Structures are given as structure tokens and as C-alpha cells.
Design an enzyme around this catalytic site. Structure first.
Site, PDB file in Angstrom:
ATOM      1  CD  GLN A 181       0.140   3.061   4.226  1.00 56.07           C
ATOM      2  OE1 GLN A 181       1.195   2.814   3.556  1.00 56.07           O
ATOM      3  NE2 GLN A 181      -0.521   2.149   4.925  1.00 56.07           N
ATOM      4  CG  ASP A 203       8.274  -1.610  10.853  1.00 60.13           C
ATOM      5  OD1 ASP A 203       9.129  -2.364  11.295  1.00 60.13           O
ATOM      6  OD2 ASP A 203       7.167  -2.028  10.220  1.00 60.13           O
ATOM      7  CG  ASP A 244       6.271  -6.666   8.585  1.00 62.89           C
ATOM      8  OD1 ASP A 244       5.273  -6.611   9.320  1.00 62.89           O
ATOM      9  OD2 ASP A 244       7.401  -6.213   8.855  1.00 62.89           O
ATOM     10  CG  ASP A 258      -5.831  -4.671  10.401  1.00 63.63           C
ATOM     11  OD1 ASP A 258      -5.035  -5.493  11.001  1.00 63.63           O
ATOM     12  OD2 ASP A 258      -6.218  -3.670  10.929  1.00 63.63           O
TER      13      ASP A 258
HETATM   14  C1  LIG Z   1       4.475  -0.779   9.996  1.00 62.55           C
HETATM   15  S1  LIG Z   1       4.828  -1.542   8.440  1.00 62.55           S
HETATM   16  C2  LIG Z   1       3.261  -2.434   7.728  1.00 62.55           C
HETATM   17  C3  LIG Z   1       3.480  -2.427   6.179  1.00 62.55           C
HETATM   18  O1  LIG Z   1       2.744  -3.195   5.154  1.00 62.55           O
HETATM   19  C4  LIG Z   1       2.867  -2.374   3.836  1.00 62.55           C
HETATM   20  N1  LIG Z   1       2.131  -2.905   2.589  1.00 62.55           N
HETATM   21  C5  LIG Z   1       0.755  -3.046   2.530  1.00 62.55           C
HETATM   22  N2  LIG Z   1       0.327  -3.606   1.320  1.00 62.55           N
HETATM   23  C6  LIG Z   1       1.431  -3.886   0.561  1.00 62.55           C
HETATM   24  C7  LIG Z   1       1.604  -4.460  -0.812  1.00 62.55           C
HETATM   25  N3  LIG Z   1       0.488  -4.845  -1.569  1.00 62.55           N
HETATM   26  N4  LIG Z   1       2.872  -4.486  -1.283  1.00 62.55           N
HETATM   27  C8  LIG Z   1       3.917  -4.066  -0.497  1.00 62.55           C
HETATM   28  N5  LIG Z   1       3.777  -3.513   0.779  1.00 62.55           N
HETATM   29  C9  LIG Z   1       2.605  -3.401   1.378  1.00 62.55           C
HETATM   30  C10 LIG Z   1       2.543  -0.905   4.365  1.00 62.55           C
HETATM   31  O2  LIG Z   1       2.630   0.244   3.422  1.00 62.55           O
HETATM   32  C11 LIG Z   1       3.462  -0.960   5.672  1.00 62.55           C
HETATM   33  O3  LIG Z   1       4.916  -0.729   5.643  1.00 62.55           O
END
Ligand SMILES: CSC[C@H]1O[C@@H](n2cnc3c(N)ncnc32)[C@H](O)[C@@H]1O
Ligand SMILES: C[C@H](O)COCC(COC[C@@H](C)O)(COC[C@@H](C)O)COC[C@@H](C)O
Lengths: 277, 280
Positions: B29, B84, B154, B157
Site C-alpha cells: 500500500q 500506528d 484495527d 476499508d
Molecule cells: C492506521 S493503521 C490501519 C492498519 O490495518 C493494517 N492491516 C490491513 N490488513 C491486514 C491483515 N490482513 N493483517 C494484518 N494487518 C492488516 C494496515 O497495514 C494498517 O496498519
């Protein structure tokens, strides 16, 4: 004008912007303000005043239901209601869902907001023709200074300094015993200091003033609030069963649980208020 | 300074005046670290607002306190996402927490958040916290039965690395991994801007767990500013029984959350209640 839909932005303090892509259907300046009627892709038709979001068809019930239903379910009687502002017609629509309401006087200083709202925003103002509604073009502040003692069961301010202490004292004078005052009370996020000052002003005038909290996505921060005031402590928590049972099936948001919920105060509000006790 | 916008389906935009401090594309991302005039330092992922120094407690207190106040035990907590740091900060306010496992897929999110967003992630030094860079979905598929008291998702979308986090098999593994009396919570999007997803989440989680109940709050930087979370557990009504000792330790340390806010946030608007019925 623009060929295609444009970004219509409300800029807060030159450092936040909230915008909706849409068409301008009409823009004019009245003697009081710039009125912009828009057709948004996300919310349908709406209204800005002086480049600030006021309403839109699919983001309005969240404002209008919170202003109206907590007072109208709790006032000892609801025969006579005064709306100060109400230009878009959504407040009086909510007030007129109750069968007990006998008369609603709306007092709006800018006749062009009512005309333009009746012409383009009919899907929000569905009650303009209700024979209980009396629309008066004039100064709302002068009206409450000039109104009879104990003449209204509910007073709703639907607009936003000129709402000073003398205004709120007239409101208490004009309210009937058992009656309720309510208005918008800005954002605890974007306007905290004015939020707290309004709570303190109404707390000095009435026996009780309570804030309550909800959502308006088109207002600064989307985190909005209202203020309930009456001269009976604890009245804000006691909606009438029969009014709730009648209103709940006709509204999109408001119910007995939303009513109790909205008055829960975030710790930062409770602390800002106790710092000044 | 420049307008930094989150654009929502070419229809809605939310912008903050500020400056770009760091940007990169990881294997997962686009990561944007900013400073904003209005809310201080923040984080975008794929041009969606995640967090900021002065707009973060409204999200982190809501995700964390309702489950942590109500689970029968809180000794072991699993946080999926949370790069974060703000979620684990809230979890680590409880004395009875013994271990917090943070499984974040994108190590660059943890590193940039440690370097620039230390003001949100104030708890990285807590000895009880174990940071694991891995996929959350794979982690709960592998974890043994009844190994965590609380699972908090946490994530972002449903489109990209966070997509599988919205599926039934993931939710089944979460209910398997939870100890008795434990609690699952996730952010659940917005009933204004993602009503179809929000109601599908409620429905899928309500089916998997004995009970799942949405709860509502404010995030001004998220689309509509009207946000939501999902509480789930194998005890109907556990969400209404926050423990007095936990509330009295937590309330003085938090900006919004208290007993009254906890109970209020579960009040359901009519159109959410009726939308779940139209779904049947
Ligand atoms: C502002 S932090 C929102 C978080 O969700 C995380 N995240 C998204 N999908 C996954 C997953 N399948 N496993 C672990 N972490 C995730 C992102 O990389 C980010 O830190
Ligand atoms: C309010 C919250 O703490 C309640 O805990 C749920 C619960 C207590 O059992 C119910 C009681 C015997 O009628 C049951 O959770 C069962 C689910 C997981 O199927 C769990 O408490 C058990 C701990 C003490 O091991």
C-alpha cells in the site's frame, strides 16, 4: 455555468474542507446572505448559506430529528411551537408529525431562503401546506422580545453574538410551564469553547440545561450537538410513552434509546464544565 | 502547505491543509506521513485518512474500551492491524493485561509510525507488547483454540490488504481462538457512507457469534465522520455489563469514554434496525 459536476467545498478556518460534487441549480445574494441551491451526487438537493453547508435531502434527518424529537416527546404540552429560523422546512415537518401540535409559528428573517426552499427543496419541506403552520418573515430575536409571557410550549432555534443572554431570558419568559427550549449547540470538536459557553449561558437562565450529541456529516467535523433547557430538572430524560409510540414508526433515526443516548457527555465536556463550576 | 484530501467515490471529499513529510509504496500500500495545521501529524494509507495526533482518541477509545471493560478476562489480547500504535496504547492501560500480540502485515507502517507518530504510539516500550509482522488472517487460522481473551481488528476499508478481514471463515477462526467470555471487536465502517457493507458485517458476525451489536461514534477524518464498530461475543448482552473496577481505572486516563458513553454508543438508529430486517 460549469459543464459537469463541480466540487462545492465548505472551508473551515482555511485548513479543513468538506466538499460534495454537484451542480448549482440557483445562486443569488439576498439582503442577508448568499443562497446556493445545489444538486449533490451523494446527498441529492441541498442548500448553502455564505458558502457553508446547511442541508441536503439525504443528510438532513440527523439534524432535524435531534433538534425536534427530544423536546417534543418531553414538553408537558406541545399545542404551540415557535421555530426561529426553519427556512428549509425540515424542522416544522418533524414538529407537525405530532397530532397534539395545534399551531407552529415559523419566524425566518430571509424570505428568499423560504421561497427557494419551497421551490427546489420540497423533498425536505413536505409540510408547507399543513394548515397548522404560520410562516412569518421577520427578526426572530425581536419576535421573542415582543411575544406574550407563557405563550409557547416549545421554542426551537434552527439557526446560528446575537443569541445572547437577553434573548434566552425572553425565551424562558415566553415558554409556558412545563415547556422546552432547544437549539443547535455547535461542535464539541470544532467549536468547543462556544459549545461550553452556550451550556453555561442556558444553565444560568433555566433551572436545567443539558447538551446532547449526534451527527451532521456536512457540518464542521460532522460531530454536532444541541442544548435542551427547561425549568424542570430531569424532564429531558422523561419522554411521554404515547408520543414515543406515535413518533418512532414515522422517523429514520430517533427512538427511546437514541433519546437517552444522545445526552451522554464525553469526559472532555464534563471536565470543561467542571473547570468553571 | 497543500490540501491533503480523502476523496470518497468522486462524490465527497475531506481535506486538511498541511505538508507531506514522507511517502512510499510498500509491497502492500501507499503510506503517506503528513503534518496538518488542524490535527498535527498523521497517516494516510492509499490516500485514506488513518490517524492524526489530535484526531485519534475518538477511534482508539471506541475500538478498545467496550470490549476490554466487558470480557470475562483480559490477560491475553490480540490486535490485528494497529500499526500506528494507538490501539495497543489503550489496551495497555489495563493492569490485568499480561500479553498483547500486534500482528500487522506491513512492517513499514510500524516503522514510520514509531519514527513520526510517537505521540499516538506512546506504549511501544511496554514489555507486555509483542510486535509480529505477519498477516492477521493467517495468524488466526494457525492459532490454537481458546488462546485469546480479546481480538481487536484495527484494519481499514474492505479493498486491498484489509479485504479478507471482512470474510466469514476469518470470523469463524476468531470465535474459535477466543477464550470463554472473550470479546471480538472491529471497526465496521459508516452507516452513512458504507451502509450496505456495515449491515453485511453486522449480519455475518451475528450469524457466526451468539451476538454481534454495532456501536456508533465520531471520526471527523473518516468519510461522513459518522463511524461505527462491531462488538461480538458468545454471551448475548455482555456488551451492557462493563466492570466497575476497569471503568474507574480507565475513565481518568481517556478523553471521551465512560460508563454513559459506553451504553449510549449501542443505541441503534431506526434505519439500521430496519435495514437488518430488510436483509431478512
Ligand atoms: C492506521 S493503521 C490501519 C492498519 O490495518 C493494517 N492491516 C490491513 N490488513 C491486514 C491483515 N490482513 N493483517 C494484518 N494487518 C492488516 C494496515 O497495514 C494498517 O496498519
Ligand atoms: C458479563 C460477562 O463477564 C459474562 O461472562 C460470560 C460467561 C459466564 O457464563 C454465564 C453465567 C454462568 O450465566 C459465559 O461465556 C460463555 C461463552 C464464552 O459461551 C463466561 O464467564 C466464564 C469465565 C469466568 O470462564
Amino acid at each position: 455555468s460549469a459543464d459537469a459536476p463541480v466540487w462545492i467545498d465548505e472551508v473551515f478556518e482555511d485548513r479543513v474542507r468538506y466538499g460534495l460534487r454537484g451542480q448549482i441549480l440557483w445562486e443569488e445574494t439576498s439582503p442577508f446572505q448568499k443562497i446556493t441551491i445545489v444538486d449533490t451526487e451523494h446527498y441529492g438537493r441541498g442548500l448553502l448559506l455564505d458558502d457553508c453547508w446547511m442541508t441536503a435531502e439525504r443528510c438532513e434527518v440527523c439534524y432535524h430529528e435531534y433538534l425536534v424529537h427530544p423536546p417534543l416527546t418531553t414538553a408537558a404540552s406541545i399545542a404551540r411551537v415557535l421555530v426561529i429560523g426553519g427556512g428549509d422546512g425540515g424542522t416544522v415537518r418533524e414538529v407537525l408529525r405530532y397530532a397534539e401540535v395545534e399551531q407552529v409559528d415559523l419566524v425566518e428573517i430571509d424570505g428568499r431562503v423560504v421561497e427557494l426552499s419551497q421551490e427546489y427543496l420540497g423533498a425536505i419541506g413536505t409540510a408547507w401546506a399543513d394548515p397548522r403552520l404560520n410562516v412569518k418573515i421577520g427578526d426572530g430575536i425581536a419576535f421573542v422580545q415582543t411575544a406574550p409571557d407563557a405563550s409557547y410550549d416549545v421554542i426551537l432555534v434552527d439557526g446560528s453574538g446575537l443569541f445572547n443572554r437577553e434573548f434566552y431570558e425572553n425565551c424562558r419568559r415566553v415558554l409556558k410551564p412545563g415547556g422546552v427550549f432547544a437549539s443547535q449547540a455547535e461542535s464539541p470538536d470544532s467549536f468547543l469553547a462556544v459549545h461550553l459557553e452556550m451550556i453555561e449561558t442556558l444553565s444560568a437562565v433555566f433551572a436545567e440545561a443539558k447538551p446532547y450529541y449526534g451527527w451532521v456529516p456536512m457540518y464542521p467535523s460532522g460531530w454536532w450537538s444541541w442544548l435542551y433547557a427547561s425549568d424542570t430538572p430531569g424532564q429531558f430524560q422523561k419522554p411521554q410513552s404515547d408520543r414515543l409510540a406515535a413518533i418512532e414508526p414515522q422517523v429514520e433515526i430517533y427512538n427511546r434509546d437514541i433519546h437517552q443516548a444522545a445526552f451522554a457527555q464525553p469526559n472532555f465536556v464534563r471536565r470543561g464544565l467542571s473547570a468553571r463550576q
